[PDB]
Structure formats: C-alpha cells, structure tokens
Symmetry: D2
Subunit: 272 residues, 4 copies
Amino acid sequence: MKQKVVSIGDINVANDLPFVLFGGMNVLESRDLAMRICEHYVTVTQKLGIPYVFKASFDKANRSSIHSYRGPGLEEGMKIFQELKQTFGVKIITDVHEPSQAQPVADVVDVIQLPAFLARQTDLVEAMAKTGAVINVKKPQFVSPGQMGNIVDKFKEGGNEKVILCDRGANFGYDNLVVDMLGFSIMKKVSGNSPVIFDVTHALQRAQVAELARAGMAVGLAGLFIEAHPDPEHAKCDGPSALPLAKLEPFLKQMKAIDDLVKGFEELDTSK
Amino acid sequence: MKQKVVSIGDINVANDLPFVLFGGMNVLESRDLAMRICEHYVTVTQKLGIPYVFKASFDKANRSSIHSYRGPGLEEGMKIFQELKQTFGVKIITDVHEPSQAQPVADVVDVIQLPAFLARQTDLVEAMAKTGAVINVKKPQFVSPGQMGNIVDKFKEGGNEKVILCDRGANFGYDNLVVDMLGFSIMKKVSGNSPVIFDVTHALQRAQVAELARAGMAVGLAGLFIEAHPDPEHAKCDGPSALPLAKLEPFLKQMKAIDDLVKGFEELDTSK
Amino acid sequence: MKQKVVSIGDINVANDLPFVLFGGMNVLESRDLAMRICEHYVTVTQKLGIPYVFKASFDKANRSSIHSYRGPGLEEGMKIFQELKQTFGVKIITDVHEPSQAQPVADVVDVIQLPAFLARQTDLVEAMAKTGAVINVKKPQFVSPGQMGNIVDKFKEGGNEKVILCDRGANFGYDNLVVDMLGFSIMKKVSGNSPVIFDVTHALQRAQVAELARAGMAVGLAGLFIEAHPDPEHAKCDGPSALPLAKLEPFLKQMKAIDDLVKGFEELDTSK
Amino acid sequence: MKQKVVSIGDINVANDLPFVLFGGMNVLESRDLAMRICEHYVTVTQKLGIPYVFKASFDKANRSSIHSYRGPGLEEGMKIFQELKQTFGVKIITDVHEPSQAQPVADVVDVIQLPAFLARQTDLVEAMAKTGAVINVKKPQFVSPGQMGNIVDKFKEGGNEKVILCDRGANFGYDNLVVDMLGFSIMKKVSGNSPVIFDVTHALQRAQVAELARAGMAVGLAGLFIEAHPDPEHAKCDGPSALPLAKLEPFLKQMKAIDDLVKGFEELDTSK
Ligand SMILES: O=C(O)[C@@H](CF)OP(=O)(O)O
Ligand SMILES: O=C(O)[C@@H](CF)OP(=O)(O)O
Ligand SMILES: O=C(O)[C@@H](CF)OP(=O)(O)O
Ligand SMILES: O=C(O)[C@@H](CF)OP(=O)(O)O
C-alpha cells in the first residue's frame, strides 16, 4: 500500500515521505512576536532540512472568559500572515470557526485547520470544503481513531480531497489526555491512507514534549504539529503547552534522527 | 444550602423541587409526527403529575453525510413549535448552533439549549447570553463535571443567570459512554447549585434506558431529558437512543416513584 | 426470566428478592471494636427489616508496608467470628488469600469472599471451590462486567454453584473509579442471573456514599456490601472509605425506601 | 541524574544503558519447543549485539478453565531451564505465584517476576524479597505509574534492592489497553530511577507489535520484554500476543536502530 499525498504547494505531505513540521505559535499576540517566534523556525528548518509550515491562530473561539482576548480578528489577522509570507516564504496554517471565515483565510494561507471541538460540524465542513484548500482535521479528544473516515468522507463530498488528520490524544478519565500510539495506523487505514500528523503540544494539555514526541515519530508520521513560546514560563496560561523556543533546534534533531531512521525501514510485517 | 431556581415560565426547575421532564423527540421529522409524539407526553405528564417541556431539534449541525437531512430549517422549524405551543400549552426547548439563530428561537420558545460539542464556544454563548432566555448546557462528553462552573460563569457575564446543566455521560475508552453518578453533585456545587438534569437517551449513544435512569433519579435531579420515537426499531439510525413511546407512562411512574421518594428525604450527611 | 438464589442459611440472596446488606468493618482491629461496630448493624438491621451479614477482614494481604498490621491472623481471627456468631446470630463473610485458608474459614463462617485482585487465580478458586460454601466474587476494577461469566463458570467446575458477584466500580483513568450502573444487568445476564451486590464503600476508594448507593439500589440489586467505622475521621488511612456508624440507620432507610419501591415494580421493557 | 543498575550477572540493566531484551515464550509447552524458540533468540541476540534474557512461564495461575494446562509444574519446570541454561548460556526469568516457589526458582534462574495481578500481595513480596534475586514487577493494568514507588519501596524492606519495573499498558474503558508513553519517565522518577522495561506483547492483549514497540523504545528504556511463537496463527489462544519468530531479527533491528540512536542523545530539557 502506497500513501496519499496532500501537497501544500511545493510541499508534499505524506505518511512515507519525511515528516513535515507544522510548528508555530498558539494565538497571534503581536507581529513583533509572531516574527521573532517564526524567525527561529525558518532558520532551524532550513538549516536542519525539515519541511515547514508556520502555524498560529488569529482567533480563539474558546476560553473561560469573554472579557478576554478573542484574537487579532479575522481581518487584522490575515494581514499579519501577509507580511509574514513575503518576509519568509513559508506557508500559513490557521484554524477557522465560522463558515464565513472559510474562503477568506483560504486566499491568505496554504493550510486550513478544522478545530477538534468542531470536527463534527457539517455546516462548517461543507463550507471549508468550498475553498478547496488543504484541510487539517484535529482529531477530537472524544472520538476513536477508526471513526475518522467519515470526516474525511464528508470532505470528499464537499468536493475537497486534500485533507490531513491531526492527533492530539484521547480522554483518559476526567481531566487528562493520553496518546494511543496504535491509533496512528488505525487512522491511516480508514482515511484512504491520508497524511497523519501528531499534535504533540496539545496532547499534553512539559519536559515530556520530547519523550512524548519521540514515541509518536518512532512510529512514522507525515509530520508533527508543535507550538512554542520564547518564554513559556511567564506566558503559561492554559490550553496547549508550548515549547521553549531556544530548544527548538536541539529538539528537532531528535525528530529527524528518528523521522528518517524510521521513515526508511524495509516494510515489516509482524502479522504473519 | 438551598438550591437555585431557573423557572421556565410557570415552571420552577430546581434540584430540591420535583423533577421536571424535558421529553420530546430528536429531530423534527414532520409535524404530523411531532404532534403524535408530543401528544402522548402532554397526556402522560398531566395525568401523572410531572412538569413537562417538549423538546425537539429543528436542525442537526452534525452528521456523517451532508447529502442528508439537515433539518426543518431555522425558519420552517420555529413555525412548527408555534402550532405546537398553542395546541398544547407546553414549553419548547430546542438547540441552536450559529449565533444568529439565538434571538429568534428565543421568542418562539422557552428553554434554549447549548450543544455539548459547543459548550466551549464563547462566540455563541456571549450571543445565547443576549436573548437572556433559560439556557440548557449539555455537559460535554470530554469534560470533567468540576469544570462546569466556568461555562455557567461565562453566561453570567453575557448577562444571563438562568442556566441548567445537562449530563449525558463521560468517555470511557474509545466509543463508549458511562455516566458517573457522583458527578451530579459535583456539578450542583460548582454551578452555584444550578439545576442539574440527566440526559439519559444520549448517555446511551436500550432496555437500559430505565435501569440507567432509575439510578440517576435515585440520586436527586432537577429533571430528566429524555427522547422517544413511536417505532424506534425502524427509525434506529444513530445519535441518541429514543424510548418506545408506548412505554412513556409506565416508565415515568418509575421516576416519580423515585424523584419523589428521594426528593423528600431528610438531608443526610454520611460525611461526619 | 427468574433470578438465581444463593441462600446463606436462612438467608435467601437474589436479584428480585429484597436487598441483603453485607455490612461490617474492614479489618479486624479488636473484638472490643468488632462488637461495638457489629452491635449497631444487628440493631438497625432487625429494627428496619433488612437481611444482614456481618463482614470483616481477618487479614490484609495487601498494603504499602510489610512492617504494618497484617491482621488478626487466620487463627486468632476465626475465633473472633466465633464469639461473634453466638452473641448475635449473624453470618460471617470474610475474604481469603491463600488456598490453605479456604476450608478453615468455611467452617467458622457462612459467606466467603474472593479478593478482586485475585478473581483470576485458578489455584485459589479450584480450592475455594472445595469447601463448597457461598462465594462472593469482587469484580476486578480492571475487568468488564461481561467477562464475569467465566469466573462463575470456573467455580461451577470446582463443584461450587453458590456464587454472588460484587461490583466495586471500574478504572476511569489513572487513580480513579467510576461505577457503571449499566454493568449491573450485564453481570446478572452472564452469570446465570446470579446475585449481584454493590460494594459501595470501595467503589469510592465521602458524602457520596449515599447518593452513589442510592443510584445503585435504584437499579435493583441482591444487596449492598458496605463498611463503616465509629470514627472514620481519625481512622481515615486508605483502601476503602467507611461510613459514619451513627449514620448507619438513617442511611439504610434511604435504601429500603428504594430497594423495595423498585424491587416491586411491574417488569418493564423499554426495549421493544 | 544518573540511572540505577540492577545487573543480572554479567548483564547490566539500566535506563541509560543500551536496552536489554527479555524475550522468550509465554508458557512452557515442551522443551523441544522451548529450545527451538529460544534457539532463534540467542542467535539473533549475539548476532545483532543485544543483551538477552530468555523468559517463559512454567505456570499459569490464571485461565478461564481449571480443566486446562496449569503448566510444567514448579518442579518439572525448573529442570527445563536447567538443560536450557547450559546449552545456551542465557539467563532465565520466570514468574512466581505462591510464596513457596520463591527461593527455588531463585536458584534455577537469574531474573524473577512478580505477576501484575499480584504486584500488591505483601505476603508474596516479603517472600520474593528473601531470595534477594533480581525482581521484575509487572505494572498492574489498574495502577497509575506514580504509585510504583511503594512496590519498589516494600521490596527494599524485604531486604531486596534489585528491582526492575515492567509496563504492559493501562485500562482504557472495558476490555482494552493503551500504553501511556509519558508513564515511562513517571516510573523512572518514583522508583529511584530503577530500570524501566516495556512489556509490549501484553500491552496488546498484531501488526502493531512493532509500531507500538518503536514508540516505547523511541522514548528510552532499560529494555523490552517481548514474546513470540513459531506459528502464532495456530496457537492464537488468548492472554498475550506473541511475535512471529521468523520476524524476530528484522524486528530487533528496528529497536537497536532506535534504542541506540536515542540512548545516545545529549540530555535535553524542553522544560525551561
Ligand atoms: O489547535 C490549537 O492550536 C488550539 C489552540 F488554542 O485550539 P483547538 O483546541 O481548537 O485546536
Ligand atoms: O441533544 C440532543 O438531543 C442531540 C440530538 F442529535 O444532539 P447534541 O449531541 O448536540 O446534543
Ligand atoms: O473488600 C474489602 O473489603 C477490602 C478490604 F481491604 O480489600 P479487597 O480490595 O481485596 O476487597
Ligand atoms: O507476563 C506474562 O508473560 C503473562 C503470561 F501469561 O501473564 P501475567 O499477566 O501474570 O504477566
């Protein structure tokens, strides 16, 4: 069985290809920051030989306070990815929440994400289906990997056949996530062997961001979807768990020294 | 500690008051049906002495097929609750998915629901907050009961202090729900002792609809949120698990013979 | 379908019969205590009209310290149930851990228990099978209710057909138990409809001992297996979670007002 | 922090050292088999440069049938490891169930195992503590990794400070196991940094034996504890899930190409 390809421009995402990193930041605080943060990625990517896609949310449709920072707005956000694209020649993956924001972001970016909590919102998929851009479906915490075909299915109907599946762990009792490594293959299978990527940072809700991402990668993935802040310690609010930027590179060597070593193994079958 | 009250008109919903049944049907197939189905409730309610709120969805924002029946539309749906209200003098609780549908349904109905999968969508809450109608928050499968305060919190800010919490079980491994009876009190506590109701039918994803609803009720609740079809057997698709309409009454005797017996116990403390 | 009966002497344990309480204490600290503790049960039982079986461990084969109190020993323990039997005309259920202790305890007591952690130890079952006494199998935290037939099966072979199944909740993530009410019927079914009892106190690892035991009972059981200490507060170590003795009675009224009300319902079928 | 060492003879087991494989078979069917099966290991081990310990049970204290094959008996079993030791100069790790079998097996073997279901049986630990041999504690399906210190603790008291911790996954709903990769470090920490090994085959209750064991190893372990049969297909009963013997080697290359690559990384800290 050969793997599917959901190429993002000159980028070819696939399960047998070398892992593609969809790094970035969580929310778009300020460009002065977006760029310092993005700055390092591009440098470490190019230097280490790793495909890359910058990622950042231009909105947070979910929080525990409305009187809080919604986000750079759907308008003042797209413009930031603009100055970003040019200045670094990197792709932009950002999530969307309302059907209307679909087509817009499609033009300003390359990869568009479907928020886990919404992976089951027909009205928004049949819409994210129109743009026809690459889609990244975040595997809902509450859904078994074998049920991922239907989402990939529904997208096909919307006339979109360029989808990637992102895993961020599964519910393990109240208030806790565990990542079932066996679920990565289960998703490849039911998704027409679509690209499976591992969202490590929110899979952890740590010093575990590595050991946990080494295990995923030592299984074989189309890539990692990580996040990091220049000074997590002080920004440490809640939602995902960003990586210490300075450790970006030394941590990505861990991956390649694996995403390769494994990505080039003679197909094994411990089955028969 | 006295319980909070989120009265729906002449109806007083509360944890110490007798249980209020929010029965009904799942999706609004056709009025000819809505009414036959609703017909029985009203009869059995009045006859058995049980507060009642008809419930039915006028839309299904989630399915495994877009080429499917979305639903009676936000417009042609509100009109159905119309002929319904008059003809039976019963309240109408229906869920909403997009912020725009908020205020409308508010006028056509009494109780409005926040879809579990969305219990964490600020943009829709701060909006369902404006109408200022009674809200029913479906406890997300993926969220510990102690985290329910924040949703009830956020609503307060939106200027709405009339909320009810509905429990539909918690994730127990891949593809399975279990209802943690201990979670009912945990929710009362963090929600300013708001009305806690038990959504039994989708808590089961059966002959279990009773044994499972007898256990919930034998704990003390502000009410049950059930669903039923006149011929489940043939309609049995997937989503919730409706009750055999003919068994409505004989099954509600089970409850009152409990929602009372228990609702009138001298406060116990096995604590000290 | 009629229920099975595993009568303990003049006691008839069954799923349709009124619940039988297997109360008692955890470990046998000292007779001066065993008796004060047992004292109250017998009084409240007789007075409230509830079958009763005193229960207490004469040993603790599991702890977090060997330099600790193993227990009254298999010898000096049996003697205590002796002065107990006579003085109160109540049955004695105590757990066993090693095959050798099987036949002995069989003579000194009525009901013998198989420790959950060991429900899968053939060598000890084929032995607890010889005595031929009533057996109480504690449902292992780590085993789905539908797998309980095999234990009941294996016992039959050992030539013992008098078994009762006790449920103490299921694993819900790391360090936590939740009791799946739906599992009570699943066990009745696969166990030739054997007596199913609910071990509430260790199902909780509280002020929840009631709300949690009201839910179980409001489902229908052959009985509850509870535990209590005269001053939990100061004895509060760890293992199970005992009930405040003084609250024994007021808490048992909760049950009968349920174990009856429900135990006498006209068989319902929300199935068809 | 440096890792602890629980050397089994000329073998040095540790978390930073290269992984030690505790392969073998499940139950001791017949020597003619034990040896063909063991035969391959030794060959592939020596040839690939991997420490090795043969493993096989001489007994099965747990099954779903007493009229079944208990096992080669504690006596006729020890003798088999005898002809085995000599003929291959490999260590023998076998589990024990009753305190009496402790000291015996200690003499005939090198590494002795404590059966998961019993990891909490003081009476057997304080006994497996006397021999003073290397102990391998199988992490109970039902116990959070952070609670593993106490077992390692209790052993110390029994006067034994040579213990290894084996992980075989955690309960994920009824009838299912998932291996939480993050739990490997949590165990190292609370066990005085004792050797942590990954029991992959029963962690699966497949073609997953590799992808699942690549993830564990790509985290860093003191070794793998695997099992395999020459013709699984026809022996496929139930308990663990053995590996196709012929695939032993090609599968162990997967590991070394990882247990090394990772075992020699410059300590990283994604913490600060
Ligand atoms: O995916 C993300 O990065 C985050 C960011 F908050 O939110 P969501 O839970 O919808 O994925
Ligand atoms: O609540 C309901 O009745 C159902 C009906 F489909 O859907 P949801 O999962 O959003 O609650
Ligand atoms: O059942 C009991 O009462 C207790 C008492 F400690 O232990 P176990 O976990 O074996 O049941
Ligand atoms: O560890 C093993 O190999 C097996 C073999 F059956 O049993 P247990 O569950 O006690 O570990």
